[PDB]
């Protein structure tokens, strides 16, 4: 599907922009209240959201599927990393044509 596709590029996106620290692209995918769910508990900013992720040092992000409502989305994937597979759910919302990141849980 499109969907998937364009899920996967901003994807790509996001992962190499948190692996260099590229601060003007992350604020350009991240919505600024994007929020990170870490073991049932919603982190709010993204602020935390930029850190936390970078923390992990991702080295993959692989999307299993994507369900688009409207502008949103859904996605559900595999973030590697520590050498073990985390799966993850990931919303999304669409903005001027782009993908932007409002919520990531690592379940």
Same mark, same amino acid.
């Given at each position: 599907?499109?969907?998937?596709?364009?899920?996967?590029?901003?994807?790509?996106?996001?992962?190499?922009?948190?692996?260099? +620290?590229?601060?003007?692209?992350?604020?350009?995918?991240?919505?600024?209240?994007?929020?990170? $769910?870490?073991? +049932?508990?919603?982190?709010?900013?993204?602020?935390?959201?930029?850190?936390?992720?970078?923390?992990? +040092?991702?080295?993959?992000?692989?999307?299993?599927? %994507?369900?688009? $409502? +409207?502008?949103?989305?859904?996605?559900?994937?595999?973030?590697?990393?520590?050498?073990?597979?985390?799966? %993850?759910? %990931?919303?999304?919302?669409?903005?001027?044509?782009?993908?932007?990141?409002?919520?990531?849980? $690592?379940?």
């Amino acid at each position: 599907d499109e969907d998937r596709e364009w899920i996967e590029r901003f994807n790509r996106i996001l992962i190499e922009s948190l692996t260099t +620290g590229d601060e003007h692209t992350l604020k350009e995918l991240i919505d600024p209240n994007a929020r990170l $769910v870490i073991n +049932g508990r919603d982190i709010h900013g993204r602020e935390e959201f930029v850190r936390l992720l970078s923390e992990m +040092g991702v080295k993959h992000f692989h999307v299993h599927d %994507v369900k688009v $409502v +409207g502008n949103k989305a859904v996605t559900r994937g595999i973030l590697y990393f520590n050498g073990r597979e985390y799966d %993850v759910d %990931v919303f999304t919302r669409k903005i001027d044509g782009r993908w932007l990141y409002e919520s990531l849980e $690592v379940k």
